[PDB]
Amino acid sequence: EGLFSQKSFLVLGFSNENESNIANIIKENAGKIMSLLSRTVADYAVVPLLGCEVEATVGEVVTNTWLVTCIDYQTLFDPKSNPLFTPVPVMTGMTPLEDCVISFSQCAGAEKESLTFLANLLGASVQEYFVRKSNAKKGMFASTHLILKERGGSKYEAAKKWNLPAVTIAWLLETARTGKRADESHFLIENSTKE
């Protein structure tokens, strides 16, 4: 049976185009689309990354990043498993990362897209490749920051070699929440490992 079999959804806060596209994807995966006026509580309200008005009781408010991620991995992720699966608080109008240049490691698909969005919204330049020296010919700028999930990998090793901060995604989310550049020393990847 479909991924969203026996699950029901509100779709809220999107343009007409996006509402219908999201509804179509849900239904293609055997999900049910409910009305704000429905008899029962929807399992999920699917909303934008930054949230929107949710006037009705629902099981969990979730983002289209969650929706798309579930479908990409054919897995029904717990919304609590990733902070981008639920609305992300962003202080509007603030650009604390305007002089920062970010590369991501270990992030893919919708998560990477959403992280890229957030980084750009805060004023940062996002680079596909992580380098310490700009390359005019290739249109690449040196990164000031690496954002990643785990110790390990090529960009990880390079950030250590080049003495560049390599931080957890929480650094970026805390910067978004406050509108102020968070203290990198509170979020270093080398200090993130637990259990």
Residues 95, 107, single domain; the answer is yes
User: In angstroms, what is the resolution?
Assistant: 1.9
Q: Which burial class, exposed, middle or buried, applies to 110 when counting CB atoms under 10 A from its CB (0-12, 13-18, 19+)?
A: buried
CB 165: neighbour CB atoms within 10 A?
17
**String of DSSP letters for 56-124:** S-EEEEEEHHHHHHHHHTTS---GGGSGGGS-----TT--TTTT-EEEE-S--HHHHHHHHHHHHHTT-
The sign of the CA dihedral 87, 91, 94, 97 is: negative
Tell me the CATH number at 38.
Answer: 3.40.50.10190
Q: What are residue 97's phi and psi, to 5 degrees?
A: -100, 20
Query: What is the domain extent for residue 34?
Result: 1-90
CB under 8 Å to 28, separation ≥6 — which residues? 2
Residues 85, 96, single domain; the answer is no
Residues 186, 101, single domain; the answer is yes
**In contact, 138 and 127? CB cutoff 8 Å:** no
C-beta pairs of 15-24 under 8 Å, 24+ apart in sequence: 18/64, 22/46, 22/64, 22/67
Residue 156 CA from chain centroid, whole number? 20
Read off the amino acid at residue 120.
N
